[PDB]
Design a protein around this ligand. Structure first.
Ligand SMILES: CN1C[C@@H]2C[C@H]1CN2C(=O)C[C@@]1(C(=O)Nc2cncc3ccccc23)CCOc2ccc(Cl)cc21
Ligand SMILES: [Cl-]
Lengths: 301, 298
């Protein structure tokens, strides 16, 4: 019993964190085999950031300009290439701590663990969700760029995020490990704003199922709803539309608890209408949306 | 910016997790040097009587896909120490520390000697932890990291009927009035860790949340008279001193922040949130706030 926001064990990722220094700029890199991945803005100055021409800035660099540090050992850069917004630094040593890994691009609503690093050293691990507006509500300070987001299902680390920037609202934007940004963001200091955020509906429903599995039933009601009527109500509270995919995904939790998805949708409609009335669900006074249906099944079963 | 419930990087502890099987019971062990530490209920009570009947070859210890050979066994309070032939090459610099209620630590939840998740939690004033543990999680450990030294402070033993968890320090001494036996046991009435709520209000100020601040201050005695009424732990002069750096960084005196907390307790938040929470968070110590809002690494 119990429900916690749980991150994956960070050990496999810790052994990949390195420090990347280019001029006055120092950030984190991900050392996998003989390649160190890092945000390409490591080659920029604060001046270059407004309208940088990364191809132009990168052609002027040589391998000895990139100082890569793995613990107390300096790695030797033997090549460099750019793939979208990520810089790939070919090094002369393959990381012996390289785990079984994949590069996966995630969809909004998906969760992952973040190993926050500064100067190539891990400081903490926390759980995140890719928000519907493609930002992440992380905890990042200056020097955290290059910190990665990941999932460790089985013995394979799926890297899904690399931190690149903080938006004016304190939310974070980054790319997958192929350098493609999540969202309409660019690695420039030009005016950028996160779009209006929405609540990840399928995740709130999954978390209501986790509460039922943990013995919390006060929020359940005798009502059901059509999928369309649920969405018409949900949209008014800035909740993401619930698709038939989401309803299918929630099927196992619906079978395990005996509460139909549209039946749980009716509880959610009621919670949106009434609030909690001094009550909590899984120790929270708000509806939690950073637990996917997969996270709930993994943690509860 | 941002404030998250953050656990320590679990790598140093992951390299210590092993599977311990004795009879029908399989749980987790902590392999440090040539000793595997695990809950003594793995032999299950008269634990001295049950242990004298066991031989080394009854404990099947597994580190990944390698079976460790047990060469001795002894009991220290509620922990079983299995002397093994092989010293763990991944043994980090470590200490066994007993924590006080209100202190936080990271839990590496394991099943079958394999780590599945890491989460940050707090030793409740009633000596329980609000963890996330399923069957097979016994032997999962709680820890903090100081520079490069892992301070092990908790080993999971049981779940109480309310879904909260009870365990021991690494010397086998339970936190709280709990015993490792199937009997009627209940967690005492819980209280809110006051110094931690104040630390979390300072973290909100550092992050730009100031709506809860007021022009008022309070005496330490008047704050405690109010705090006792809301099942909050008494705030000591130690706590006020500990909050000193956050008070200096934000420009808000501790007793000034106490008066904001007093208003939050009598009036509520009024549809508002603090750091994305509609409740006052008490599982961040003053040190956790300083570490996160300054970025200390390991
Ligand atoms: C010389 N510059 C320093 C480094 C390397 C080069 C550019 N850098 C940056 O990351 C700067 C920056 C950024 O967002 N950095 C940060 C990341 N996460 C958390 C932070 C918390 C506090 C302060 C900064 C943070 C902030 C200015 O705006 C932009 C615009 C686009 C991009 Cl992709 C990045 C940035
Ligand atoms: Cl996904």
């Amino acid at each position: 019993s119990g429900f916690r926001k749980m991150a994956f064990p960070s050990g496999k990722v810790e052994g990949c964190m390195v420090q990347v220094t280019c001029g006055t700029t120092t950030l984190n890199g991900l050392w996998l085999d003989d390649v160190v991945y890092c945000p390409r803005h490591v080659i920029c100055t604060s001046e270059d950031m407004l309208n940088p021409n990364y191809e132009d800035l990168l052609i002027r660099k040589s391998n000895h300009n990139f100082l890569v540090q793995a613990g107390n050992v300096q790695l030797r850069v033997i090549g460099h290439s750019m793939q979208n917004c990520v810089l790939k630094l070919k090094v002369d040593t393959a990381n012996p701590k390289t785990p079984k890994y994949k590069f996966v691009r995630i969809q909004p609503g998906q969760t992952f663990s973040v190993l926050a690093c500064y100067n190539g050293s891990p400081s903490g691990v926390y759980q995140c969700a890719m928000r519907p507006n493609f930002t992440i509500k992380g905890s990042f300070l200056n020097g955290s760029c290059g910190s990665v987001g990941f999932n460790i299902d089985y013995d394979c680390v799926s890297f899904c995020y690399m931190h690149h920037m903080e938006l004016p609202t304190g939310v974070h934007a980054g790319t997958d490990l192929e350098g493609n940004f999540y969202g309409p963001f660019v690695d420039r200091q030009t005016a950028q704003a996160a779009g209006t955020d929405t609540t990840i509906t399928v995740n709130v429903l999954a978390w209501l199922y986790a509460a039922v599995i943990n013995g919390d039933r006060w929020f359940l009601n005798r009502f059901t709803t059509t999928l369309n009527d649920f969405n018409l109500v949900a949209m008014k509270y800035n909740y993401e539309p619930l698709t038939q995919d989401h309803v299918d995904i929630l099927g196992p939790l619906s079978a395990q608890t005996g509460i139909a998805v549209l039946d749980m949708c009716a509880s959610l409609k009621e919670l949106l209408q009434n609030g909690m009335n001094g009550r909590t669900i899984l120790g929270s006074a708000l509806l939690e949306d950073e637990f996917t249906p997969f996270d709930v099944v993994r943690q509860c079963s």
